[PDB]
Write a protein that binds this ligand. Structure first.
Ligand SMILES: CCCCCCCCCCCCCCCC(=O)OC[C@H](COP(=O)([O-])O)OC(=O)CCCCCCCCCCCCCCC
Ligand SMILES: CCCCCCCCCCCCCCCC(=O)OC[C@H](COP(=O)([O-])O)OC(=O)CCCCCCCCCCCCCCC
Ligand SMILES: CCCCCCCCCCCCCC
Ligand SMILES: CCCCCCCCCCCCCC
Ligand SMILES: CCCCCCCCCCCCCC
Ligand SMILES: CCCCCCCCCCCC
Ligand SMILES: CCCCCCCCCCCC
Ligand SMILES: CCCCCCCCCCCC
Ligand SMILES: CCCCCCCCCCCC
Ligand SMILES: CCCCCCCCCC
Ligand SMILES: CCCCCCCC
Ligand SMILES: CCCCCCCC
Ligand SMILES: CCCCCCCC
Ligand SMILES: CCCCCCCC
Ligand SMILES: [Ca+2]
Ligand SMILES: [Ca+2]
Ligand SMILES: [Ca+2]
Lengths: 378, 380, 160
């Protein structure tokens, strides 16, 4: 059995549980708070109902405890306008909508001769401070710097139904990025909207899809969206209590054909040039061609240096480039050794080395690819 | 709990209008203060003070004295002792002992000791300071500084500029203190928490006309971006501040001589903008992990961290508190080793191996080609 | 996108009630409709949309005035060449129901083709011709050496 007590809105005690409790109102207006402190329990409460021991009827009348105001939310993404891979942030353009019901905002038409009252170019905080009523203000959790806003409007109906509309361009931090498997990496773009009020005042309750969540645009894009989701949760809030959160997540991947055709095929041809020369039996020509192919490899590497992000740590592509360069240089070393062996009159050993290299090199490349796949993608 | 504050009391005798709370004084008095019939309660406090080479002058402020009160002070290790009001007009001089009596409605006093370590004894309504006997009784005679709790957390290092020697960081800051002047009565607002939003501590202090512990970043470059800025106060007077910041800080201490094997320190300094006799940092709160973990790799790897409170000289004399967070960082060594040193070693080996050849034309041609390969790799 | 820079902003009204607005602007506009697949032979549209912030039952665009040339001529060459333009008034759905008017200006533009042709394609053709012509030789060592050199020349031109 837990302890039960009753206090006013300031914390002054009024009654204590004996578990049951009773009180009678003396002041002009009494605002009460019920404390239960200690497992699952049943709490029964009534006003002007001394028969709570044996009620009989299903709960009648209006609710005794105050209820939170319910908010409908929706978000749509129009265009991803940038991604920063060193500072780990991205920028997005979209639209946001909020809707709720509050009888305190209602008005009488015969005093204005109008059905719709509107506020323009003002944040919800400013309007709340102007009309001296609490409203469900919000913020972006990972916002970097100021936010650009267009078509900002709030309008209210006589019954008290209010709605908010905004078109935004914002930059959001994303420390969850992981570029280890570049360019085969997959990322998540998460947009979080948090209410700036306690959960006992306002709470997100429904999700509205006023448009397509991810909009289609003409032409190609750098990032391709595979799927999306939307969810409502609760998170701890400053000064205790809890605040609601609305999250939109986009799963994205890069364009693979671009990287494959631009990098890997020319690299394969360059490697093949250094492999094929071992069929020659004139070792001077082999040495000269190997020396030229190393320079060609370096030139291609710095030509593609533009598609090589500088992050301060190694990706898959960097490792492959390093291994390929090392093997290309080892080819030149072996060619010099074979030239010397042929000069001293041991051509048979040079031919045996040629056969060994021709057999071994592709096996080494295939084994390295298998190892990379095992250690980075499973 | 109990409560503290000032009050107004209206007493009436056969005057039924008093219960309305608006009774104006009338007639001839009938009641008086009871405490005036006996001796007043004494307060005694003892302090140990030291006059360093550069700190030969010391001053202390006393609480307010009511008319009719008396003040006593003595010093035993001889330095000079004197008493002045808050402006500074002299009131008494030491003979070392000193004595004074209060004439004005409110008296604010300052004790001067100037010249080694000395004992200072002070009392209000306590002429027996020569032989006190009892351990220091009552409330403190000298005013006390307000104690502030501070904490800081780092979320992400977002950039480092190696030519201008500055870096940028994202994190969270928290402050908490207690001030009875900020207290309020709930029955006037029907609420337990009063809040201020989207305003700096300076702006709120200027709006409510009360001193508050404002702060700044010592090495801040340009403007600072702030989110979720809020101040809220409880009826007892407990206040707290919260902020999420993104800031760029100068760091002239960087040294890149041993690059890429260099090690650096990222130091974040928070200084109070008020004298130490008003507010002072006293405790460190760890509300989160000081260094937060993030998915993926980072350019800089944090090895260790520390947090410390110190005191630094302040403009217009006195001193101000400082809270410092330091991160020790290093670069990723595998990246540089695998990307630079191994290919360089292979290139050097190519130029070394050619000397086994006995056909010097081939050796010359291969050396000439390898020099060009070296230059190409260097610019790559 | 972001803030707009404005100069010479003025509103003046006559006693009869005739009012007019004037502004000189510099602005950055988003254009997700771009498609660069056929680069450098691509053609694009630059669209400028002005929307009234009031319901159509209050104010509506009714006439188009050509106070100047829509596309102004400037000395020197430009990266983009305007081929044609158009102006039109339409109606679009508005927040809190109803409708709002829209005024659209569209410019059809293309790149300078001579620049790309002369700078890229002719040297590439000559480089390809060098690798084609060597097969007339019957000394295969010379052919191999020239092919190896021409591959490096190709890579150098590509990164140039
Ligand atoms: C990893 C290694 C890469 C880093 C190493 C860098 C260090 C530089 C290389 C050291 C090379 C020293 C060998 C001496 C040399 O090159 O030529 C001299 C001798 C003949 O000498 P003499 O007859 O004039 O006295 O010539 C010889 O006959 C010596 C015989 C050596 C046989 C080498 C052939 C190995 C074939 C193995 C199959 C390929 C391995 C594939 C590896 C991915
Ligand atoms: C503008 C042109 C640039 C773009 C053209 C790119 C197209 C590629 C060039 C086509 C070349 C085809 C000619 C065939 C060739 O090169 O060699 C083969 C013949 C000998 O053949 P055979 O005897 O083995 O059957 O060798 C011959 O004997 C053929 C005789 C051809 C004479 C060429 C010499 C011309 C001298 C003119 C003076 C220089 C012009 C200066 C221009 C600025
Ligand atoms: C290393 C680049 C790829 C070249 C093709 C290799 C296929 C395997 C053929 C092995 C032949 C060995 C003959 C002695
Ligand atoms: C200079 C690059 C490293 C090459 C390996 C050198 C190891 C020392 C061997 C000395 C051999 C001398 C033979 C005459
Ligand atoms: C490939 C670059 C262009 C070179 C000109 C080719 C024109 C066609 C001539 C075919 C001649 C075949 C002779 C055996
Ligand atoms: C999903 C990832 C597929 C990666 C395929 C790489 C293909 C390399 C082509 C080399 C051809 C010579
Ligand atoms: C969706 C998972 C894709 C996994 C691709 C693995 C490729 C391994 C070879 C890498 C060579 C650089
Ligand atoms: C802590 C610093 C270690 C530096 C080691 C350098 C290794 C160079 C490798 C060369 C291999 C041929
Ligand atoms: C409208 C597009 C015309 C493209 C013409 C390309 C011309 C290539 C010239 C090559 C000469 C050797
Ligand atoms: C694009 C990566 C190419 C690497 C070399 C592959 C050799 C395969 C040997 C069977
Ligand atoms: C979507 C991947 C296409 C790559 C084709 C490669 C053919 C050698
Ligand atoms: C993981 C990188 C290794 C670089 C040297 C490879 C030589 C076969
Ligand atoms: C963390 C340093 C790894 C470097 C390995 C080098 C092997 C030749
Ligand atoms: C406007 C296109 C001119 C290109 C001329 C090319 C002549 C070989
Ligand atoms: Ca990350
Ligand atoms: Ca420095
Ligand atoms: Ca597009």
């Amino acid at each position: 059995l837990p302890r039960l007590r009753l206090t006013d809105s300031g914390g002054k005690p009024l009654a204590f549980g004996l578990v049951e409790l009773n009180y009678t109102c003396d002041q002009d207006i009494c605002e009460l708070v019920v404390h239960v402190d200690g497992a699952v329990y049943r709490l029964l409460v009534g006003i002007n109902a001394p028969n709570l021991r044996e009620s009989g009827q299903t709960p009648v009348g209006s609710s005794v405890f105050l209820e939170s105001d319910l908010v409908t939310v929706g978000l749509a993404v129009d265009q991803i306008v940038g991604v920063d891979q060193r500072s780990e942030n991205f920028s997005v353009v979209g639209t946001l909508k909020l809707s709720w019901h509050d009888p305190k905002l209602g008005f009488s038409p015969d005093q204005c001769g109008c059905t719709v009252k509107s506020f323009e170019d003002a944040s919800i905080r400013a309007v709340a401070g102007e009309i001296n009523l609490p409203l469900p203000s919000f913020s972006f959790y990972n916002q970097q710097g100021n936010r650009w806003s267009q078509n900002q409007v709030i309008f209210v109906t006589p019954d008290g139904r209010a709605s908010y509309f905004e078109r935004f361009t914002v930059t959001l931090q994303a420390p969850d990025f992981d570029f280890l498997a570049y360019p085969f990496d997959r990322q998540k773009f998460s947009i979080k909207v948090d209410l700036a009020v306690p959960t006992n005042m306002f709470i997100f309750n429904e999700i509205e899809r006023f448009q397509q969540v991810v909009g289609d645009q003409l032409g190609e894009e750098e990032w391709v969206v595979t799927s999306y989701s939307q969810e409502i949760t609760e998170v701890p809030f400053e000064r205790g209590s809890t605040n609601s959160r609305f999250t939109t997540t986009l799963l994205v991947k890069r364009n693979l054909e671009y990287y494959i055709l631009r990098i890997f095929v020319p690299l394969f041809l360059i490697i093949s040039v250094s492999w094929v020369i071992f069929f020659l039996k004139d070792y001077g020509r082999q040495l000269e061609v190997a020396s030229g192919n190393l320079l060609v490899f370096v030139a291609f590497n710095f030509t593609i240096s533009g598609d090589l992000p500088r992050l301060g740590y190694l990706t898959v592509l960097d490792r492959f480039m390093i291994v390929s360069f090392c093997l290309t240089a080892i080819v030149v070393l072996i060619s010099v050794c074979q030239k010397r062996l042929g000069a001293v009159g041991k051509q048979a050993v040079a031919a045996q080395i040629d056969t060994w290299v021709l057999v071994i090199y592709p096996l080494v490349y295939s084994l390295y690819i298998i190892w990379v796949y095992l250690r980075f993608f499973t | 709990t109990y409560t503290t504050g000032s009050f107004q009391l209206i007493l009436g005798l056969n005057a039924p209008q008093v219960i309305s709370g608006e009774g104006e004084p009338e007639g001839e008095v009938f009641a008086s203060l009871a405490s005036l019939e006996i001796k007043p309660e004494a307060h005694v406090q003892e302090l140990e003070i030291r006059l360093d080479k550069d700190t030969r002058y010391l001053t202390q402020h006393t609480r307010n004295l009511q008319p009719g009160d008396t003040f006593h002070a003595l010093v035993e290790p001889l330095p000079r002792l004197r008493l002045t009001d808050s402006g500074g007009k002299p009131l008494a001089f030491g003979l070392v002992e000193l004595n004074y009596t209060c004439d004005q409605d409110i008296c604010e006093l300052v004790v001067h000791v100037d010249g080694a370590v000395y004992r200072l004894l002070v009392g209000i309504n306590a002429p027996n300071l020569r032989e006190s006997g009892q351990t220091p009784v009552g409330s403190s005679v000298f005013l006390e500084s307000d104690l502030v709790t501070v904490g800081l957390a780092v979320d992400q290092i977002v950039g480092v500029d190696q030519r201008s020697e500055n870096f940028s960081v994202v994190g969270t800051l928290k402050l908490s203190w207690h001030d009875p002047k900020l207290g309020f009565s709930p029955d006037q607002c029907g609420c337990t928490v009063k809040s201020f939003e989207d305003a700096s501590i300076r702006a709120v202090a200027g709006e409510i006309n009360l001193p508050l512990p404002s702060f700044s970043f010592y090495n801040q470059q340009g403007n600072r971006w702030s989110q979720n800025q809020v101040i809220f106060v409880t009826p007892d007077g407990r206040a707290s501040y919260f902020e999420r910041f993104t800031v760029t800080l100068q760091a002239p201490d960087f040294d890149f001589l041993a690059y890429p094997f260099d090690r650096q320190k990222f130091s974040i300094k928070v200084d109070l903008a008020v004298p130490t006799n008003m507010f002072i940092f006293n405790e460190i709160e760890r509300f989160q992990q000081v260094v937060g973990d993030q998915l993926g790799e980072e350019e800089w790897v944090v090895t260790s961290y520390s947090q410390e409170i110190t005191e630094v000289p302040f403009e217009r004399g006195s001193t101000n508190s400082r809270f410092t967070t330091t991160l020790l960082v290093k670069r990723n060594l595998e990246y540089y080793i695998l990307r630079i040193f191994v290919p360089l070693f292979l290139i050097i080996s190519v130029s070394w191996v050619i000397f086994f050849l006995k056909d010097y034309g081939r050796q010359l041609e291969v050396a000439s080609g390898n020099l060009l390969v070296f230059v190409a790799f260097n610019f790559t």
